[model samples]
Target: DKTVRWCAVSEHEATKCQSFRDHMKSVIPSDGPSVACVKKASELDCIRAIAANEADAVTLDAGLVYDAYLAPNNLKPVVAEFYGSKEDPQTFYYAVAVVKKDSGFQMNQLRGKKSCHTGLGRSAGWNIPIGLLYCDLPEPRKPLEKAVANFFSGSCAPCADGTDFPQLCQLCPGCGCSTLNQYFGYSGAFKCLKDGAGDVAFVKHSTIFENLANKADRDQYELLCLDNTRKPVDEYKDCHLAQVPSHTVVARSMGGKEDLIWELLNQAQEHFGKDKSKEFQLFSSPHGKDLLFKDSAHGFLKVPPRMDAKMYLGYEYVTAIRNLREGTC
Candidate 1:
């Protein structure tokens, strides 16, 4: 009856929003005449808005999208994902950008700092980066660990699991190590870093450096390396990290409770993908699905089982207390 409403989080940016919107418009019907763009907010805000019925459909990084949808209530995921890629289609290493003033603090510097992540952004921003960091970065230097044991000892929170983000940050404070605090958007990082916030804030590498270059603060800042290998990884590969599905547009309520939204979404393979190419095409989610489960995709076949798990759960399904609460990851 009304125009299809759409919203996106600022972490996703205007470009990503417009892309998803245009693509959705290209796919579904509009015999009622026009498809209106109702609201576009930051990724986290947009998610809440959609869940609250402030908007109809929305877009977000697929990796973080499921987490955002799960965090809020009443949001049903009708059609899960679409495919797109610049190259191999993987997102790697959540990044921490430090103000030039705090440049001296390396990844090691995060040992006892007030690391901050916008509450909404961590589902993607912090969690993903921290997951990658633990695998890619090395353990703290013995001297550093001893100093922390000597100075900030006594376990303020929990010690870091070799793979846990927030734990990692608690283990290393000023360096801003927690994946939970791994931040979501470029602007969020900008806001936190504006007056010199978190000892070091995790960010998307390209975004942070690009922002710095734009402000002529490039020389002032340094992209904190996860480990000795990150530099060489960037150098040899000519890239800093693996890329993940940063965005997605979902379908819901096509025909009400007996909705045909899934059918409509499946058509995306033909509609937005070929010559008609909507700016934001569906995300194929190959790697997204691959890395989501420990073995086969059956593990991540739905959302309910992923509660204790980290981000990127492959497909989106309505996981109400009824649908999801019965299981564990």
Candidate 2:
């Protein structure tokens, strides 16, 4: 019997990944392939594993999906996530800039403020918001990295090299990039704001609602509308800076057993999906939250047949990403 090796990003995710593998064995002991989970250093490492045939699959943020589809990895998305009502499913969500209700600043007034981002190349916290900020740059311009460094007095954009752009990484907890720095992803960015180190946090719309202390605390934050106006946090659908594509599960283009991977996930959902519980939940973690995917996700949505990176991310969003990559590189 063959084994499907899945890559996991953190120890918390690794445990859930292993549990899911064991549950899959119990679900279809004989006919289906066995499953194995491996611990990877980062999301990028997971993509590298798939490309190198060291692992079969792993869920990825849209930004990493683009990276995997390019260069040496060349992986392809196998599925996308669905978030809203099952009857009227949503394959995408809004990316919003968040600030404290008392911050006394609007979107256009962010110059010289402290900032927090999910990561350097992330869709919500980096690419879209950065593209908007750089739109005002004149023809003969500085690199996007330099412009951002000058725009914010300080920031905590994880995955940026301190040696290359010291200002961007200056505000990170312990002032370091990478996961070793707790002030990293969506949660980390929110924590950066909560800790009062950052005046603004660039994250997905759901981030604040998902991490807040209470409903009243939720009211303490607001969305920075693109029109330079502000709106209540829950109004993201209409007031967002940009709408981003959903994250995905990716696998190598050759010998990847896309059908088998989907079969495992679909069946697993029947037994262990968000609302479907069978001793082993498919999407949760006892050790830490958001083990395999965003905790807010409803379930996986099959990618439209033959969808590639460009098609999955759409025209405008892909163009922003491409521009960010070109200017930064």
Candidate 3:
């Protein structure tokens, strides 16, 4: 039988993919497809690999999904994540500008302030906030990265060490891009704000609770609304940077083997779903925080046919991202 090739972003993720491959071997339905792992240096490389037919599938957040939709890649999502429960599977989450209650700054005055972000190229972390904050400039076009660097006093936008914008990557603990950088992802970005390293954090709305569920200090923080007002963290639905879709699994649009990819994931979940099997958990692993799929995923939902990345991310959000493209300022 044919095998579905999965793209892995790191060694730890590759290891988990190997375990998933091994576990699929003992499937009760022997007719089901097999699995293969293709290790790549980053998610961008994985998208290129899938485009060139070197790999079959990779899970991507809404931000990266747009990249896959660009020319030369032309990939589309086949499986969507169910981040909530089966009875009420959530399809979207909010991106919020979380700041300490004491930081006397409004959203409009974000310039000249220190900032923390999920990463250089993520939805909630970079795109959403940057996209919303982008102001038009005259030619010799001042691009978004340059604008961001000049605006913020310092930032921990991880995965940006190689860029001309060191200001965007300088303040992070361990001050470099990668998982090893303490202030990298969602929870990490929040920690940067919580510990007073930065004035504001761009992260998912649920980030604060997900990281600090055990503490009452949650009241010490608040959300920065676009209307020059501050609100409690729980008011993110009404006051947020933007509402973004859940992460999804993508494959080539032309002949990415969507059937095998969906079949493999759907069947695997029946036995190895959340807390279903100790042998090989599809959504949980110590190897990495989010390997192949999000760690918080409850299950999977197949995207309807014709649902490409641009369509999945929606017209307005897609246009907003287009406005923030690096070349246009």
| Highest-TM-score candidate | 2
**lDDT value for candidate 1?**
0.37
Rank list by TM-score: 2, 3, 1
Candidate 2 on 1-329: residue-level lDDT in tens? Answer: 46778888767677778788877777776977667888876787787888889999888778778888997888889877777756777788888888999778888788889999988788888888888877553332355667788778989888776777788887784443334567777778888898998998898878888788588999988889978788998889888888788888888788987888787777777777777774787656675555677776778877767678887887877787777746532
Instruction: Count clashes in each candidate, considering only residues at least 3 apart in sequence or on different chains.
Output: 43, 0, 1
Residues 1-329 of candidate 1: C-alpha lDDT, one tens digit per residue: 23555453323333433554466665567642223354343444555666666766554445445555455343444333322232333332234434444445555555445443423223324444444333222334232223223332122122223233333334234322222232324444544555554444444444444344454555455554546222321232333323343343443322222133333334444555424453434332221211111111110111232132123333332222112223222
Candidates' TM-scores? 0.46, 0.91, 0.89
Residue 16 accuracy (lDDT) in model 2: 79
| Residue 107, model 3: Cα distance from true site in angstroms | 1.4
Q: How accurate is candidate 3 locally (lDDT)?
A: 0.82
In model 1, how large is the Cα lDDT of residue 58? Answer: 56
Alpha-carbon local distance difference test for all models: 0.37, 0.79, 0.82
The CA lDDT at 53 in model 3 is 92
The numbered model that scores best in lDDT is 3
- Model 1 misplaced stretches (Cα beyond 4 Å): 8-33, 37-54, 68-102, 116-124, 129-184, 214-216, 228-243, 253-329
TM-score of 3: 0.89
Q: What digit string (tens of lDDT, one per residue) describes model 3 on residues 76-145?
A: 9899998768889999878999999877989888878999998876899988888777763223325556
Candidate 2, lDDT over the whole model: 0.79
